[PDB]
Structures are given as C-alpha cells and as structure tokens.
Amino acid sequence: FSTAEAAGVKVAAQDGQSPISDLSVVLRGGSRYATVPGVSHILEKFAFQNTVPKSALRFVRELELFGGKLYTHTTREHIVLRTQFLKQDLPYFVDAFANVLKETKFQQFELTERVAPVAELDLLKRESDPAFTALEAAHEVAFRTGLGNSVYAQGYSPVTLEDVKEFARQVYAKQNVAVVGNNVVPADLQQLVGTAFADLQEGSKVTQAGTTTLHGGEARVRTSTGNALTIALPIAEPKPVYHALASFLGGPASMPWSVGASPLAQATVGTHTSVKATYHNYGDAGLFAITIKGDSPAEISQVAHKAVQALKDTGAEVTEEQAARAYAKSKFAAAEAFENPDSSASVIGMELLSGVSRIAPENVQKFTPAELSEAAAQLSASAKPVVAAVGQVHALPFADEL
Amino acid sequence: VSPKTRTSNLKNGLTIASESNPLVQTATVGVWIDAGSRNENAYNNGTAHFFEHLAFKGTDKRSQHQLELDIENMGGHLNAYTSRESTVYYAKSFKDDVPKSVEILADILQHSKLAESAIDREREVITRELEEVNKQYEEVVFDHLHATAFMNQPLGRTILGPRENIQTITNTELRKFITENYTADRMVLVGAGAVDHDALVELAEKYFSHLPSSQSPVPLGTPIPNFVGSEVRLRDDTMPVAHIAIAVEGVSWTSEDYYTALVAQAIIGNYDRAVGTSRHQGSRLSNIVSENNLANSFQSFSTSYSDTGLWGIYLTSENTTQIDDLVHFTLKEWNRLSTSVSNLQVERAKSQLKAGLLLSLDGTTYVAEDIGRQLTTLGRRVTPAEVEAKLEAVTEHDVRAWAQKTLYDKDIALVGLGPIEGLYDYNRIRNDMSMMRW
Amino acid sequence: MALRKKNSLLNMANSYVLDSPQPSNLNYFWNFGSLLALCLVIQLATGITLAMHYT
Amino acid sequence: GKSTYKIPDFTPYLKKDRNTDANRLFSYFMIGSFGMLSAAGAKATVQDFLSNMSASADV
Amino acid sequence: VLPWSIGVIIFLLLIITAFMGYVLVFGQMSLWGATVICNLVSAIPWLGEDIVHFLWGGFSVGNPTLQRFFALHYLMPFVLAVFALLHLIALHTAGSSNPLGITSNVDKLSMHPYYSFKDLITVFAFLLMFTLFVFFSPDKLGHPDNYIPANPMVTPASIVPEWYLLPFYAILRAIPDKLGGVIAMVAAILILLILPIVDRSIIRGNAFKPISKLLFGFFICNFLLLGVLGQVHIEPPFIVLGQICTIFYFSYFLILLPMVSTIENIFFYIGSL
Amino acid sequence: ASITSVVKTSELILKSPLLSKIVVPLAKTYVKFSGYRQLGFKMNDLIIEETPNMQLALRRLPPTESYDRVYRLIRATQFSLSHKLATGNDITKPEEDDHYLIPYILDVEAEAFEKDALDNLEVV
Amino acid sequence: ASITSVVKTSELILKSPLLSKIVVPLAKTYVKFSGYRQLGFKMNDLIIEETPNMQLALRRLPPTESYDRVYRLIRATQFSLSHKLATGNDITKPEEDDHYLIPYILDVEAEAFEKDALDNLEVV
Ligand code: HEC
Ligand code: HEC
Ligand SMILES: CCCCCCCCCCCCO[C@@H]1O[C@H](CO)[C@@H](O[C@H]2O[C@H](CO)[C@@H](O)[C@H](O)[C@H]2O)[C@H](O)[C@H]1O
Ligand SMILES: CCCCCCCCCCCCO[C@@H]1O[C@H](CO)[C@@H](O[C@H]2O[C@H](CO)[C@@H](O)[C@H](O)[C@H]2O)[C@H](O)[C@H]1O
C-alpha cells in the first residue's frame, strides 16, 4: 500500500490483478472519540443516507446497476465504510464517498425511521452471542470511558439528531479521513480523491476526552439467552508479545471435531464449552482477554479455573516447541488479518491516521520461551483483573474466586 | 483481469489446478472430491459424514494427538465438509507451509486408521448431532425440502443419515466407501493464493501418486431424479418466526438454462430488514415485502446438482397473520417472469450478476472453492470472459421461455416450519403458480 | 395485503365464501345448506318470471 | 415413527409420469370438459329461460 | 370514491324504479311515456328494434309490458335497498366527511344520541311537507292526463316525463341525432363517475373555495334550467337555449372544474406565503 | 393533484415579474375571501390527509407542530358546530399562516416520485 | 349438564353394590358400541369445550397432555374425512382411556359453583 497525500487527504492504494476493487474510507470516529454514547454507531449507519446531490434511494438503485456492495462497521477506533465494485467503476465510488462526507442531509425522519431501527437490529443480532456481550462488558469495566464507551447504540441512552450532526462536523473533516484502495491503481486514485475531496473541511484531529485509565472489577449482565465469561487483564503498556501469548494460549481448534493442542483448548476437555484468548492493542492501553462460552454455568466455572491456571503455568515455563508454535500461529493470524478486507482497511487506516507503521506478517517477531513466560507472569500478577459474567450470573465465577 | 488457472493431470487421473496470487501470503490447498452422500445407498447412508469425523482421528503414522500437534505447528488450519454430491478437505496455511499441509491431507485421505475404538466414540458424537441441527432452522427447512422434493431418491437422503445407521456403521463399510469413491479420477488437488503450480504438481506426484483409479473413468461432474410436488409442515406455535421454503425443480450445472435460471433468480433477489440498503432495492417483491412488513427476510436460491436442481425462495417472517399475503405476493412475482418481464428487469439483473459472479471470489479459500467446485461439476474452470458471454446471451425472451416451462403452473415443494397456521393448504399455494388474467 | 382482504366489500364476500375456515371433515350432509341456497335462487328467478305473466 | 426426514409411504398414490406435460394436460382436459358443458348448459338455460319474455303464442 | 360510485348506481336504479312505477297506472301519460322512453332503445345499432320488442313483449306497449313492469317495479326497490346498504358499508371505512373537509378523527361523537335526535327534526320537517301535499294538494305534482285511461289511438298534447327526469330529457333533446341524444343522456349521469379524477384540488370541498362556490352555484341553477327546458315545447328560442345549457352541463365536468380547481390550488399556496 | 405540482407551478409564477405582478395580489384577495383564517386555521391544515403520502408526512412533523395542529383542528371543529367565528387571538394573522407541512410532504413525494422513475429505468 | 353432576351421580351408582353390578357391565358394552376408541380418541376428548369453564380447564392441562390432545384430535379428524378407522397402535386400548381432563374441569367448576353459592349468602 503506497501511502500518499491528495488535497490534504491521506490515500493508500495497492494495485493488483483482479476485476474487483475495494475502496474504504477510514474515519477517526470510533467509539473512543464518541461525544455521546453510541454516536459513532449512529454515524456509521447514517452513511449513504440522503445527500444533497443524490438520495439514498437513487444511490442504492445505481449501486445495483454496477453490482457494487456496501459494507460499514464501527470499532472503538474507527468507522469504516467499504465499497466493493468492478475496477472500472472507481470514479463513481470516489464521488459517492465525497457526497457522503460533504453533503449528508441529516434529517430527523431518517434517524427515527431508518437509521436508529437498523442500529438497534444490528446490536440485537450481535448480542445473540453471549461471548460478544461478555467481552463488551469487560471493556466497560476495564476502561470506564473512552475505550470503555459502548461501541453500539443502546436503547437506554438515546442519540439525538443534534448529537449526530455535531459529531459528524468533527469527524467528516480532512484531518480524520483516510482513503484505502485495495486493487486500485494508486496514481488514478490520487487524481480522483484530489478532485473530489478538495472542498471537504480541514477541521481538527478528533481526540479522546480524557486519558485512558485502567480499573479492575466485575460486570454481571443477567441474560436468559446463553452463558459466557470473560477474564480480562488491562495492559498499561501494549507490547507485541501479547499477540504471541494470545496465539499460544489459543483456544479454537485447528482441525474439525477436535479439541486442539493449545493450553486453553485442553482446558475444555469433557465440556461443551469453547474458549478464545484475544489481545486488543488500542495504542495507549491494551486488553488481554480469555472468553469462555457454554450452555452449563457449572462447566464454564470449571473451565475458568483451569484457564487461569493455564496462564499461571505459562508464567512458569514455556518449551522451545511451544514458543515456535506460537510464532507460527501468530504469523499466520497476522497474515489472514491483512487479507480480510474489513481488518485490512483498519490496519492501514491506523497507519495513515495515527503514525503506527504496520507490522508486515513477514516481520512478526519471534519471541523466545523466556519472553513469553515473562509476559504471562505479568498477567497472572495483575493488580486489576476484570471479570464479566453473562447469563446465569448467580452460578458463574467471581474475580476473587479466580 | 485475474491470473490464469493452470491445470495439469497425473498418470492415475488426478487433476491439479492452481491459481496463484503474488499479493497474498497465505495459501489454500485442498482436495475436492466428486463424491458425497448421494453415493451411499439406504443401508450405509451417513457413511460419508462419518468418515469426515474419522479422517481427523489418526492415521497409520501420526496418532490423533500427533495429528493435532502437527497442524498446530504448521500454523494454519484444516477444514472439511461433505455435501450430497461433493466432499472437500482443505488446509489454509502460510506460503512456505504448503508442502506440510499437502502431506497431511494425503495422509488422512489415504492412510486413516478407522480404529474400532474411535468408531465407537464418534458414534455418540454424531448421535448428539442429530438433536442439535434442530436449532439451525434454515438447515432443517432445506433438509426437509430435499427429502420431499426427491421423495425416496438418493438426493432426498440427509447427510447425517438415520440414527439406526449411525449405530451400525462399521470400519469395513467406511473402508469400502472411501475405496470405491475416493479415486483419482474423481479428485482434484487445488491450490489458491501463494502457491506455485509446478511445485504443487511435484507434491502431487510425491503424495497422491499411489491413488487407485476407478475401473470405468467417467468425466468429472458426471451423474434419475423425479421431482415430487409435495409439502411438509412442521408447525410449532412456540417458535416466533416462521421459516418457509418453496421450490420447483431447477437446473443442473450443465443445463443450457443455467445462466437463464441465475438471471431469473436475480430478478427476485434477496431482502433483509436488518440491512440498511434493502428498503431501497429495485426488486418488486422487495418493495412489496418491505412496505407491508410482510417478512424479516427472503433469499432466492438456485441450487444445482449433476442431473437436477431446486430453484425457489426461502422466507422468514414474524408477521404470522399475513403469511398468506407474503406467499401470495411472492408467487405472483414469479408469475411475472412468465408473463411480464421485459428488457427492463432482465438488463438490470444481468448487470448485477456480471459483477456478482466475480465479487464472490474475494479470498484464497473462496478462490479455491471456486476452482474446486467448477472442476468437479463442469470438468473445467470457466474464464470470466466466457461467463460474461454466457450472461450476455440471456435475453428477456429466454427468461420468459424458461419461466413458462419451469415455473408457470408447475408443482412446488413447500416446507413450512414454526407458527405457520396461516399458511394455506397445498392447493391454494399451488394455485398461485398461474394467473387467471393471463 | 391482498385486495380481497383489504377492500371492505370484497372482504365480506371473502370471509363467507373463500377464506372462510371450515372443518376439514364435513360429510355430504353439510351440503344441504348450499342446496337450500340454490332452491332459494331458483325460486327467486322462476317466481319473479311467473309474476311477469300471472294476474 | 420418529425421524421427520423419512417421508411416509406415498407409493400407493404417486404417479410415475407426474412431471410430464401429458399428465397435466389430462387433468386440464377434464376441467375443460366440465367448463365446456357448464358453458353450453348455461347458454341453453339462459336462452330458453329468457325467451319467456319474447312475444307469447297468443300475441 | 367507492361509496360515491355505488351511489351513482343507486341513482340509476331509482330512475328505473320510478319510471316503471309510473307506467303501472296505465293512464295516458303512463302509456305514452312508456312508448317514447322505450323507443329510445331502438337507437342501439343493429339489435335496437329487437330489444324494444323484447322489452315490450309484443309490438307496442300493452298488457305484456304492464305486467312485466309490475313485477320489476316490485323487485327494483329491494335491489335499491341492497345497494344503499352497500354504499354505507363502503363508507364505514372512512367515516362521514364533514363540512370543513378536514379529518374528524380528532373529535368524534356517537351517532346516538346526537344524530338520532337531530334526525328527528328533519323527519318532522319532512312530515309537515308530506302532509301539506298528501292531504291538501295531492295532485299538484302530477299530470291530469294520467286520469285519462290509456288510449293507443289518441296522442296527448305533450308527452313529458315526471318532473324529476326532466333535466335528462332536456339533455336528450339538445342532441339532434337519436343515438347521439341517448348517449348524451346516459353520459349526463355516468359523468358523475369522473368527478374523483377531474377535481384537481388539494383541498376537500367548497367551504373555503370562493371561485368553486360560484361555479357550483351556476352549475346547480343550470341543472334547474335544464329541468324547465325539459317541459317547454320544442320551439324557438328554447331550442338553442337547451343546447347552450347542455354544453354548460358537460363543460363543468370536463373543463371548468379541472381549470378552477387547479387555479385555486395555486392561489392557496401563493396567497398564504 | 400533488403538492409537488402546485409548488412547482407557483414557483414559475413567482419568478416571472409580469405574472407575479398580476397573480400575487389576486392570491392575497382570494385568501382573504376564502376565510379559513376566520376559523383559526393555517392554510396547510386544509390539505387532504387521507392518502398514504400525507399520513407519512404527518407522522414526520415535530411533536410540537403536531400537537398544535390537533388543537387547531379541534378548535375549528368547535367553531363550525357552534356556527361561530374565531375572534381576537384565535384569528390566524397573516404572519402566523406558516407552511409548516409543505417541506415534509415535498420530501415524501420526492422519494415516491423518484421511486416511480427508477422503477422504469432502462440500462443503455 | 355439568361434569360435576355426572361425576357425583356415577359415584352414587358405584357405591351401591346392586347398582354397580348391573350398571358397570352395561357401561362397558355401551362404550364398546360407542366406538370412539376406533378413532383413537380418549373419552375426555369428546367433552364439549366451547364453554368458559372448559376453556379454562383446557388451559390448565400440563403441556404434554395438551400437545397429545391436539394430535389425537387431528388424527381423528383425518380418519373421519378419509372414512377409515384407526388400526394397530392408533386404536385406544381400554388401559389408555384415562380421564386426563376430569380433575381439571372438576376444579374449575368447583370454584364456579362455590362462587354462585357465596354470591347468595345471607348473614344470619
Ligand atoms: C313473485 C316472485 C315469487 C317468488 C320470489 C316466489 N314465488 Fe312462488 N309463486 C309465484 C307466483 C306468481 C306463483 C303463482 C303462479 C303459479 O302457480 O305457478 C307462485 C306459486 C307458487 C307455488 C304454487 C305452485 C303451483 O303452481 O303449484 C308455490 C308452492 C310457491 N310459489 C312456493 C314458493 C317458494 C317456496 C318460494 C321461495 C321460497 C317462492 N314461491 C318464491 C311468485 C313467486
Ligand atoms: C350519487 C351518490 C349517492 C346516492 C344516489 C345516494 N348516496 Fe348516500 N351517500 C353518498 C356518499 C358519497 C356518502 C358519503 C357522504 C359523506 O358523509 O361525506 C353518502 C352517505 C350516506 C349516508 C350517511 C349519512 C349522510 O347523509 O351523509 C346515508 C344514511 C345515505 N348516504 C343514505 C343513502 C340512501 C338511503 C340513498 C338512496 C336510497 C343514498 N344514500 C343515495 C352518495 C350517495
Ligand atoms: C354468502 C354470500 C357472500 C357475501 C357475504 C355475506 C354477507 C354478510 C357479510 C356481512 C357480515 C359481517 O361479516 C363479518 O365481516 C368480517 C370481515 O368481512 C369478518 O371478520 C373476519 O375476517 C377478517 C378478514 O377476512 C378478520 O379481520 C377478522 O378477524 C375475522 O373475524 C367476520 O367474521 C364476519 O362476520
Ligand atoms: C347477455 C345474454 C344475451 C341475450 C340472451 C338472448 C335471449 C333470447 C334469444 C333467443 C330466444 C329465442 O331464440 C330461440 O330460442 C328457442 C329456444 O329457446 C329456439 O327454438 C328451438 O328449440 C325449442 C326447444 O328448445 C323448440 O320449441 C323450437 O322448435 C326450436 O326452434 C329457437 O331456435 C331460437 O331462435
């Protein structure tokens, strides 16, 4: 991805050999920047509504003539708006993104009838998975605000049209916009972005109101629709070793109808439970999480004990074999993330909008058994462990039990 | 313009097909087999699915545990699925982990233990799978749909097989199945992503050279299905959403009408209330359904097999007092493919498909699945230029002619699941397959 | 929504002669109702006609 | 008795040639014949009946 | 639109019912009216004459005609009552309109007791008018010729319909052609069916539309003039006047209402800016 | 007729100097003789609402505007049934006769008419 | 007549030795000739349910009993329309003809009749 600049907008493109181009606008407008709770989810869902040049309806009917597709999502860091189309139709898509950023009519009826209902269905679909709820709850405990803000709009805290219009006034600005083109000729994109995004405000860099503070604790989301438990450990200094540790501890199986050879996978034997270690770098803090879902609260509890033991055991000693297995699993994970268009866009988006140069999958560091065990030891000896339980919360573990 | 799909054979008759992409760092190699549940009889129905479980239960060299470790150490993953007509076993890995993955695949396919102890263990696992598919409503609906459309025929059997068979599958019949079916002339070794074709051909000569050939080598994608218009109702008043499928007999992979059926399907298209754009879609049925809140979703499908297909729509709705309207409106939109469609709808649908067929291929596993599917159903990979020409040849006249012979006044297979009290009886549904005004 | 259900007049017809939900096991002795309606129609048509010629 | 994917036996009733045009055509011939006689009977009924209104034999 | 359209058919049934009832007296007006009105059917091309003989049940209006009109006059009021009930059932979806032309959904009253007791006032007003005609002037609205027994030989001085059919008779006389005249006469009733289309106003009703109110006044008075011209002799200068009034009748539907309603739309918008 | 039609034609007239010079004073007198202000209505209260489009535009009014419309209709209905006219503050002054609904219905209709156009698009 | 009535009178007969000796064999043959078991019904499936009391008792059936009742009625309706009888396992055997509903309706009626009595109480 050749990084350049066109009329104050950072543009990154990589030409390829396919008939399919993906153009993604990455906005510095994720939930950690949200002025009011849920506004970044709402702004994402307000993309490709009525603009002054072109109605939502006309856009959709024309996008069907090109056979393009539209994908949007909100993270804690970004809003990503992606379009997938045939190579030749690039000018249309550039101009459509320009209309969205310059000329969205944020009309109250769109919010009431179109945007808000869809944002609510989006959330209900995600929450069908109790593990999603558990990991969301864990971020809320760990960070409180900023990273602790909910990503998604909730019913209890309503976003108004003034809220969304204000946030968009900050976000839709040259300083907060990056364009990423997969299988787009880089010289052609610079020319088009340079003409289309010339009239966009400059604005200023959107910032997190307040510094990231870490806290420990418990969250107990009582649902009737499945059981899960996250054990998170807030990290004050995000380091690349936690990727290797997440992949080492593992949890998912690498083979059908198997349990797996990872420590966390081996913790689930004899139970219909699944487990997954994940590490989330957010630049200035991180979260290392182990999430366990299952149907039985008794089995979840049983696994959760084994899971914390596994982390402590890792803090003791890692073998050379296990350290190499971690390097392999981690290189692979980095590669497939850079391939998946959703994650790809946000990776280069971070590079463009911040200045965190992307780590190529071929440059993923090999961590020795010493470095891995040291990282696991710091986690086992954290002053601020977080636990989010979801489901039959009366029967799930507590932080002081673990 | 995508890189060329290279294709080679071995001596035994194994096809090797590859499409390299120097932009990615991962590779998907795997084996596509022209064999699946359809190859069983009634006594060993469930064998193919049973084997898929045992393939990962240990080989003559590596034990179950060694297998697990070997794959974990590769870094990537292995995956498998058995359908009615097709079995796949693939391995996604890193670029330089391709020789390991080919070796593991060749091992689990040719040299599996199938130990009585593991047969006995999986026999419970698979028994439990019978009582948990129950939750996957779409799958429940489509499995009953095949059962009824192809009543007492091979395509009508499920993949899991009956409970009774699961209890009586022996290692002998497992062995017999994979010896008769997993032959070189029925198999394609596929690589997509960061693979060299010539490297993959060498790996095939190293691992898959001692594969048995079948006595009578037919071409890839070689097959008599007699559709039964019929209905299955699984009423469940406790469910909040009704799931309904309606299908007619569709087209096979090699039908002359294959593209005509795709264009017809695209005229009705899909709808989902949870997607933002769906309220704006051009499809007439989409507009009727969205304006009236008749459904949560619908998905048109055109499923093909070697000698038949099912073409139809799958609907989900919470509007339980207006199911009659939902079905009424849907069938009347089908009627118009026979009576009313013009260049307006046909050209719109063609435009949407010309991109759609190419868009779908957006990662190495999708590319591999495309190469594998096409090679095992058509015997060749169809280039985008040929596909563009086949689509361009579809006219409004072709769509009308096809609909009048396939849809108009034809028997349907109908499956309803959930609160379907308001779905009328077979006759009134089937009467909507024609228009008295035409 | 289907016209036969939407339009109030058509809906009254619909509710009696088309969508009307019936037990699925009525035997032929449930057919006298419609025969009585037929006799009543025949009597009306023939009766009105005889009235055109009767003094 | 238990599996709902095992369709009950319909062989006593299923026609082997069910998807053929000849099969449909036959049943439409029956429906059509019935419509034909109903049309011819209606015409005869209406013509004979309404003729009562034409000038009577005494006129 | 549906209660209105059914209404137009109720009005046609009433015309036929009352026409046939008038024949049953079998006085001179009964016979001669039946003769000339039934002869209009002879205008239907090709089969017209055959249809007339079929209606009459013979070669002229006589006993067969009288007996069949009795049977039909008995029946038609039942048909009329059914259609009257249908137009009400159709109306019940929207409810009654109101003299402001706005929604009433905001402020409803029970039909009883308020409209029940209000209907009593006009019932008693009606009964007073009824009483004055029935008891004190029973013959004022009638034609003396109907007290002469029907005589097919002697033709009365002037054969006119009952007063309520006179405007349609004037419209028929205005067109010189027989078939033309019949078409125009029927069109004068069926043209009511296009009001929903030709009225282009964004506002329902005339309470607030000064120009439409004036045009309505002229239309109503022209319909009364047509009525009067239906009973004059076919002589100058009433021949030309009949034609002008007929033109005005049709041009209300076809020209003036579409023009006036379009202009008032513009005046409401600009006038309130 | 559509509000769209009415609004477009009115704009053509207001543009032409000659046309406006002769039409605008007539329209003002027309409205004075109309006399809907004497029942405390605003012009837009009189537009026919029993239409899918108009129902949608009414739903999109801000709650305040909506509540006040309900009051005007009820008050006018009460004057009508009493055979009285508005007096004093109930009379709508020309400055209060604002087109509160026109923007809503024009947007509803814009979409409805775009939908009809796009349902007839022909790939070239 | 009320289920309560029927049940009380039956209990009077079953108490009297003489009465039971002559009535019980008749009742058994009556039921054999009745032939509801040949349609796979249980006796209680035939009780009239379009009464408030019976609606209440049916709502109080345990879900399993309720689901099975629905199946018996549907199956019997299909035999009726086909003019076939039950065969094999579909025939209700005398041991399966259990009074599943009687306890529920007797409780519903108990309360309904107590209510009527107490609505007519007179302080003495
Ligand atoms: C006028 C409309 C008319 C209607 C409607 C009518 N009828 Fe008649 N009916 C007549 C006339 C006229 C006669 C006498 C002429 C005759 O006997 O045929 C008559 C005669 C009869 C007779 C004696 C028949 C004879 O000649 O032996 C019977 C019985 C009878 N009607 C029964 C009925 C029944 C039952 C109905 C409806 C339920 C009915 N009618 C409806 C006009 C009518
Ligand atoms: C040509 C049209 C027409 C004719 C003729 C007609 N109606 Fe109406 N009628 C209507 C319409 C339209 C309405 C709805 C008017 C409204 O409330 O705004 C109506 C409403 C009514 C109502 C409701 C109360 C009212 O006066 O608004 C009654 C009662 C009524 N009609 C009775 C009859 C009867 C009885 C006849 C003749 C026997 C009849 N109508 C003939 C068109 C007609
Ligand atoms: C028999 C000849 C055909 C003409 C019809 C007979 C005329 C009698 C009709 C008027 C009597 C009122 O008829 C009444 O109408 C409404 C709607 O139409 C029906 O209402 C029924 O159907 C509608 C939809 O079909 C549902 O909203 C409703 O929940 C259901 O109860 C009543 O069940 C019926 O009793
Ligand atoms: C909208 C419907 C169309 C209008 C309907 C037309 C109404 C009546 C027109 C024909 C009535 C008289 O038409 C006449 O019918 C009678 C039978 O009824 C026929 O008469 C024929 O059959 C009768 C018995 O069936 C015999 O007595 C007679 O000897 C023989 O000629 C005539 O051949 C025909 O000319």
Residue numbers in the entry:
A (entry chain B): 15 to 416
B (entry chain A): 26 to 248, 260 to 474
C (entry chain C): 1 to 55
D (entry chain E): 39 to 97
E (entry chain N): 111 to 383
F (entry chain R), G (entry chain G): 2 to 125
Task: Give verbatim lines from the article.
The cytochrome bc 1 complex, also known as respiratory complex III (CIII), in the electron-transfer chain of the inner mitochondrial membrane is a homodimer (CIII2) of two biochemically identical protomers. CIII2 catalyses the transfer of electrons from the lipophilic two-electron donor ubiquinol (QH2) to the water-soluble, one-electron acceptor protein cytochrome c, contributing to an electrochemical proton gradient across the membrane. Electron transfer within the complex occurs through the prosthetic groups of the three catalytic core subunits: heme b L and heme b H of cytochrome b (cyt b), heme c 1 of cytochrome c 1 (cyt c 1) and the [2Fe–2S] cluster of the iron–sulfur protein (ISP), often called the Rieske protein after its discoverer. The Rieske domain is tethered to the complex by one transmembrane helix and a connecting flexible linker that acts as a hinge.
(viii) +DQ: with decylubiquinone (high-potential chain oxidized). The [2Fe–2S] cluster can thus be positioned close to the Qo site (referred to here as the b or proximal position), which is formed by cyt b. In all the other tested conditions with the high-potential chain partially reduced, oxidized or reduced by DQH2, the Rieske domain was more distal, beyond hydrogen-bonding distance to cyt b, and the hinge formed an α-helix. However, widening of the docking crater on cyt b, as seen in Pf-type inhibitor-bound structures, was not observed in the b positions of apo CIII2 or of CIII2 when a substrate analogue was added.
